[PDB]
């Protein structure tokens, strides 16, 4: 009974491993070898956005790429105008402990969550000239880690109880749940089609979930420790993950296998937050060593350093148009680089 | 800048003024963190001085917050690294799970992001320990063989009115945690042990003194004196 089930599971796992090993014919480093390197890239602090009184723990750029929402552990949710260093709004949160932040694609709502297990949605552009809590989505058992919008009505939230959940804002209750992870789901990212999303947990593995049917499609394991952040390739068929292994890894969707690993002997610190560029040629990263390391997406060579922060960089964002990159660190100042 | 832009700058200045006033009000309080396990009287000790639960108290007109989150705390413990202290309460009477308490203290003490956050240790349930060591049914040497060769350190003077066996047991338990703390302390963050009971009422004065010492060390560090 149990022995037969274990044997069948082992046989299926070995079959999948053989299938993915047989599909690996040529390394991507061997294909893009004769491609001109991006060269050394220097980016300066164009705008420093001061006004947070505690460590910034999340971030998000608006669809317009002009307004960015920053969540910090002092209980505020400032919505900066990035061009002019202007604070459009300053939302005081019910609970100081905030670990995520999201700005809706339409722009009307923001969302924040933390150790309170509740994802709060704030409505911004309304009457009476105030931002007020619209829906306090509750139902997660562990701490909330990353919340991301789909439309004005649907949200995806990953929690510390080894699960993700797709909520309807109007109903206030989960419409879909995704389970199967063993450790805390520490990060989340969507796809341009908004039909699939990849989530990384502390069991040193990532999974690909489907929003509609709610069934896992692929699982990726190439990491030795917890995946502290994940970002998704602009194409829609790949993504990149950052662990505490001091290594990034580029995974793909169709071939179901790791493509490259980004690492350097000099860096040992964990990776907090990863992001791509608009084209996908360049891959930003953020490290615990109080700076950022720029890695080419096709050469795995350190293309530059963004050493402007005093404490560890927490969140890392790239605008929709790709004009600038915003790095928010525990120094309470988040900077714009270009 | 046009009229709308100067007005937006004025609104931003009002927003920043409100933020700075709120921050000045918020920085006045000393945040803590309550950590422990099952069968540890963290609930009792917090009730005596009274997702995430919070208690608020104040002594000498100084305000405190004590947060306790209701395993695998290696992730959410990143948030509590600006706290002035971490409060660690353990069931020193229990011998079966005291070793996993030592392992937990190793986990928090050697944490990467708590590399400068001092810890306050409360060896709770001291009267249970006294009655257990008077009963003699359970021996510490059964669980910790090195207890047999351990002797009570000199210049101890715990308090007048306990048996030598009780003091020996409690001092051994304290020394285990102290050695774990001092293995890799490096002087950035230190450990404050205390023998708390279930009925003791002076559990806020101890925390006040410990927070005062932590702030004194931080002030020494900022003045470049150390």
């Amino acid at each position, epitope marked *: 009974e149990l022995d037969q089930l274990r044997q069948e599971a082992e046989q299926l796992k070995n079959q999948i491993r053989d299938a993915r090993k047989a599909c690996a014919d040529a390394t991507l480093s061997q294909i893009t070898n004769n491609i001109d390197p991006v060269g050394r890239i220097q980016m300066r602090t164009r705008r420093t956005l001061r006004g947070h009184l505690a460590k910034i723990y999340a971030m998000h750029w608006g669809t317009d790429s*002009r*307004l960015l929402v920053s969540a910090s552990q002092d209980g505020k949710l400032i919505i900066w*105008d990035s*061009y*002019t260093t*202007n604070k*459009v*709004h300053a939302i005081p949160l019910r609970s100081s402990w905030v670990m995520t932040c999201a700005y809706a694609p339409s722009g009307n709502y923001v969302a924040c969550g933390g150790l309170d297990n509740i994802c709060s949605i704030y409505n911004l*552009k309304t*009457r*009476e*000239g*105030n931002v007020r809590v619209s829906r306090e989505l509750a139902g997660h058992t562990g701490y909330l880690s990353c919340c991301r919008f789909l439309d004005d009505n649907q949200i995806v939230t990953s929690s510390g109880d080894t699960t993700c959940a797709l909520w309807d804002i109007e109903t206030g209750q989960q419409t879909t749940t995704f389970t199967g992870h063993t450790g805390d789901v520490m990060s989340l990212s969507l796809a341009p089609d908004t039909r699939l999303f990849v989530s990384g947990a502390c069991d040193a593995s990532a999974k690909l979930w489907d929003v509609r049917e709610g069934m896992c499609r692929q699982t990726f394991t190439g990491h030795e420790s917890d995946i502290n952040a994940i970002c998704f390739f602009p194409n829609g068929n790949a993504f990149a993950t950052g662990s505490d292994d001091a290594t990034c890894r580029l995974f793909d969707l169709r071939a179901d296998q790791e493509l490259m690993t980004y690492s350097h002997d000099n860096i040992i610190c964990g990776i907090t937050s990863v992001s791509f560029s608009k084209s996908g040629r360049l891959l930003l990263a953020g490290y615990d060593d109080f700076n950022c390391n720029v890695w080419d997406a096709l050469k795995a060579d350190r293309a530059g350093v963004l050493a402007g922060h005093d404490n560890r960089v927490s969140c890392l964002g790239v605008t929709d148009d790709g004009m600038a990159v915003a790095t928010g660190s525990w120094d309470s100042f988040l900077k714009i680089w270009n | *800048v*046009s*009229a*709308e*832009d100067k*007005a*937006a700058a*004025e*609104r931003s*200045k*009002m927003i920043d003024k409100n933020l700075r006033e709120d921050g000045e009000k918020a920085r006045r309080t000393l945040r803590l963190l309550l950590l422990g396990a099952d069968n540890s009287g963290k609930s009792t000790i917090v009730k005596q001085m009274r997702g995430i639960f919070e208690t608020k108290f104040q002594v000498d007109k100084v305000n405190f917050h004590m947060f306790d989150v209701g395993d695998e705390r290696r992730k959410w413990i990143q948030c509590f690294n600006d706290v002035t202290a971490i409060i660690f309460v353990v069931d020193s009477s229990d011998y079966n799970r005291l070793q996993e308490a030592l392992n937990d203290f190793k986990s928090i003490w050697n944490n990467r992001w708590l590399r400068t956050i001092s810890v306050i240790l409360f060896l709770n349930k001291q009267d249970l320990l006294a009655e257990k060591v008077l009963a003699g049914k359970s021996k510490i040497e059964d669980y910790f063989p090195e207890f047999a060769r351990y002797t009570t350190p000199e210049a101890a003077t715990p308090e007048p009115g306990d048996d030598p066996r009780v003091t020996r047991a409690k001092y051994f338990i304290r020394k285990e945690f102290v050695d774990i703390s001092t293995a890799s302390g490096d002087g950035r963050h230190i450990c404050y042990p205390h023998f708390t009971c279930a009925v003791d009422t002076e559990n806020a004065r101890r925390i006040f003194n410990d927070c005062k010492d932590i702030i004194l060390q931080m002030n020494l560090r900022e003045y470049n004196l150390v």
Partner: single-chain antibody
Amino acid sequence: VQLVESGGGLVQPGGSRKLSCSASGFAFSSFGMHWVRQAPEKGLEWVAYISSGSGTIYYADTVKGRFTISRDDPKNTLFLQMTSLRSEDTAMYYCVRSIYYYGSSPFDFWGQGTTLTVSSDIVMTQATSSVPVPGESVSISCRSSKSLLHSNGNTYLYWFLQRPGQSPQLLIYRMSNLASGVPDRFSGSGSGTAFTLTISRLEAEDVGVYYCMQHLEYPLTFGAGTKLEL
């Protein structure tokens, strides 16, 4: 939201008067406030402006030195003090709210006006005064003395509709954006010194007078207005 203003009446010239406006349904501290007068035989024209926190206070040229504006947030009230009024000062006074942040819609709500009977500037022109017109698209053209295009790329033109015997309501802010609740039929397009307003599928209760305002710099200037009749 409601804005109700009390004051006015038959006052001999040279006297002193106070108008008090009370606001309900919104946070009064956040919004900035405007006092705007409309003569019985003339169009709208700016009078005074008080900012949030009362940090900045602006007055028109005509009423500078003999008018005063102030606000009380805890009472949620606005005080306008008028000294040594003139014979042409007889008009209806409106209180207008405007919030000033990126993407905001200023002048969105106009309070109910009072009545007060007595006993350089960017010149904006509306060529058409009365246009007879339902079911037909109507275009209203407003000309500005100078280009209303700042360096940052924001054009500052606002369109207001006044219904017969009713306070004006904001229609288009910054010449492109449509305020909340404004039907999709209205549209606005143009460039510096030449702006248009297009209305499609006109129906009942759509008539009124449309005023064009510039917010490029103080003092604010209103257009003469274009009247629409059946």
